[PDB]
Amino acid sequence: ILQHPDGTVLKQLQPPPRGPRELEFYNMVYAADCFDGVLLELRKYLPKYYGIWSPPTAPNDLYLKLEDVTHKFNKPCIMDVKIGQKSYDPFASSEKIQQQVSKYPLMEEIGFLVLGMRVYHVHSDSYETENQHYGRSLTKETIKDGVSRFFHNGYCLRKDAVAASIQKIEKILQWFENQKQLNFYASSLLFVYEGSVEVRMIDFAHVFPSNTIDEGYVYGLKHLISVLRSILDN
Template sequence: MEGILQHPDGTVLKQLQPPPRGPREQEFYNKVYDSDCCDSILLELREYLPKYFGVWSPPTAPNDTYLKLEDVTRKFNKPCIMDVKIGQKSYDPYASAEKIQQQVSKYPLMEEIGFLVLGMRVYHVSSDSYETQNQHYGRSLTKETVKDGISKFFHSGYCLRKDVVAASIQKVEKILEWFEGQTQLNFYASSLLFVYEGSCQAATMRLSDVTLAEKRRVPKGLLSGGDVLEYNNNIHVINSTENGKIEASVGKGLSKFYALHKKACSKRHHSQLSLKVENSEQDNVWKTSTCITQEHLNGNVLPQLEKVFYHMPAEPKESAKVEVRMIDFAHVFPSNTKDEGYIYGLKNLITVLQNILDN
């Protein structure tokens, strides 16, 4: 099976794209995570990427190569995920005229706005359900509507999570600082992945006002032949050694940042998807299963949540559980100048987030 798999150790396997994109992304990760690396710029960059654990190939298909990466969503109970492509150009310096035209026509406002929302998935406490938006939603946003379009990602169904907005700004500012201080690399068609905890459990416990239903217990059991049936918050994996195959169904938390080749998705697999996001190559898919185990909140909790979260501080003493990571590196090139297009996009995104916070 091609595409996304989860290794039994909890990492995620991203299949290498066809040349030159796949080898270029592998080379980028190898350079940044080289054990002999002593370049302070690259060492700092590691803070903003998913951790990289080398490559992996299934024993039965040694020619299939996967990047072994950290699952950034794994630690979240109800992960809310947004993928934002950054930069004024979503095509690299070596793109053909045809490719440039194709990319520009997808989102003509890219140069002016500097970023594009590729998709989002938001947990609503009020309904105990997820809302998803695909790439068409992002491309429908204009200069006038982009603020409201992005603010939707930070809304719990009861209120705007200003704590998350504030924490996100701080993390994006750190990435901007890195870009302002480096002239080694330029990034095209690369994204920022935003993840935050949609469950209000941490905040409500901190405020001691309400409690939520306890976190889902993690069931584990043995399948025939001793194979372990594993669960986490993001992926349901059956690690089956029969016929040398590994089967996986992607669950609610996993984002598009581990690229899937669209052509490899079977009709059966497509029928399970509730969210699909194309990246600049139109061959990557953000997959989430519709088969989600619902957690029902205690009946007496919901009316109180509204009171609590309308009055949550913008920057609580204990910062919100938020991750912002750079992802998708099939179009990273050596440079001797600042990456002005990416910097422009980051600054514009920070401005939009600040406007959301100030309102």
């Protein structure tokens, strides 16, 4: 992810098949002549899409130009959460499945994994960051405190941002409860709040056509909402 002051990000396509699949996802959802009610509603929850982009002198080098969801914030607090029970897709080999489950074997039980967070601390005027090892170290005993950390600014728990996050996730959940045409593996929610609220879906290299409800995604969203709700009682 490269941030541009124009308020966009350039996301370099991942190696095939992942990068091309992400491109096709955006192209399908944002098809100008698309009138599919499901997909028009989905647009609300994605970064705005500005098309494929490559450097003037390098047509080989493919990027997606996307809305920078963090741009409108002064001190954005950012958390990336992978959603679902499975972070491998329906075409994964035994070996790849094992690779993916190995990365976080609690995915089936918890239904989400914190990929990272960056939290503005008011008292020190500084950011505290967690990397991928943080979320992969969380268990059923520790997930609630693990998520809470995102919303702690050094002096208070930001229950306002927690509640707003629940309200925004609930709309995404409603979208998922009302579509049976796409299943999403290894995709994420990006949470952003002002540390001095956004909740958007990102990372679409493993989105596949389906004829059923995305039950792993729904389980994950519901578990995540339940955790957030519990935090409101702290």
